[model samples]
Target chain A: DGEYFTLQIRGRERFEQFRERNEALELKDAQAGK
Target chain B: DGEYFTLQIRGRERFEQFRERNEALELKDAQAGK
Candidate 1:
C-alpha cells in the first residue's frame, strides 16, 4: 500500500519528465550506477 | 561508471528535494519501497 497526495502526484509527474530527460541524454547515476 | 551533464545535475538537485519532501511527509513508495 502507498500513500499519495497532490504534491506526490506533482512530484511523480516531474520525476517522469526527469527520467525522460535522462533517457534522451543517456545519463546514469554514478552513485548507484543506475 | 556514469556520465552527468548540466541537466543531470539539475535533475539530481531537484530529485534530492523531492526525496526531502517525501521524508517530511513520511511517504512510502509502494512501487519500489525506495
Candidate 2:
C-alpha cells in the first residue's frame, strides 16, 4: 500500500484563497447534479 | 466578516475513503470541461 499526506498554510490570505477554490469545486459538483 | 475553520481526521481506512471521495469529485469537474 502507498499513501502520502501533507499540509501547508501560508497566511490568512492564502487560506482565503484555498477556501475559495474548495467552494468553486463544490459548486461544480452541485451544477452537474442539477 | 465571518469565517470559520475546522479540521478532522479519522483512522487510516476512513482517510482512504475520504481520499477516494475527493478524487471522485475532481473527476466530475474534469468531465464537465470535456
Candidate 3:
C-alpha cells in the first residue's frame, strides 16, 4: 500500500485525490494477499 | 475500466467453429407478416 490519505473534493483535485486513494487501496490489497 | 478476468473473453476466446450462423433468421422467427 502506498499510504492512507484524507478525502477532499475541490475541482479536478477531487478526482486526483480519489485516484490516489484507489491506487493506495490496490496496493494495499496486493500486499494483503488479495 | 481495466478489470481482470479468466473467462477467456478476449480476442482469443471467440470460438467461431461453434457459432450458429443461421441463428438470427429474423423472418422465420417473426412469421409471415405484411
Candidate 4:
C-alpha cells in the first residue's frame, strides 16, 4: 500500500542522485549531482 | 521479496566486510531487486 506521496518524492530524489553520480568514481560519485 | 538469507560465507570479513563494495564506487541503484 502507498504510504505517502512525500516519501515517494524522497525516494525519487535518492534514485535520481544515484543515477547522476553513479557514472563517476568514488568521491566523485559522492560529490556529483545533488 | 523473500526475507533475509546468507549473503555469502565470506561476507562481512575484512576482505568481505565491505560486501557489495562495488556500490561504493558509485551511488547504488536502490531500485535493484525491490
Using DockQ, give the best candidate's number: 2
Which candidate model has the greater TM-score, 3 or 4? 3
Q: For each candidate, what is the lDDT?
A: 0.41, 0.43, 0.30, 0.31
Summarize candidate 4's per-residue lDDT along A1-34 as a digit string, tens digits. 3321111112443445433433432344246424
Query: By descending DockQ, how would the candidates be arranged?
Result: 2, 1, 4, 3
In model 1, which residue pairs have backbone atoms overlapping below 3 Å? none
Model 1, A1-34: lDDT tens digits are: 5432222333453455444644543344434434
Window of ten residues with lowest summed lDDT in model 4 chain A = A1-10
Mind giving the per-residue lDDT tens digits that candidate 2 earns over B1-34?
Answer: 5554432332343434434544554455446534
Q: What is the DockQ of candidate 4?
A: 0.03
Best of the candidates, lDDT: 2
Docking class of 3: incorrect
Q: Grade the docking of candidate 2.
A: incorrect
Candidate 4 collision pairs: B13-B17
**Per model, how much of the real contact set is kept?**
0.00, 0.00, 0.00, 0.00
Off by over 4 Å in 2: A1-34, B1-7
- List DockQ, one per candidate, in order: 0.04, 0.05, 0.01, 0.03
Model 4, C-alpha of A29: deviation from truth (Å): 10
Please give the TM-score that candidate 2 achieves against the real structure: 0.32
Tens-place lDDT digits, model 4, residues B1-34: 3332121121122222123343442244354624
Models, CA RMSD each:
15.5, 12.2, 19.4, 15.8
Candidate 3 residues B1-34, lDDT tens each?
A: 3432111111111222111211222233345534
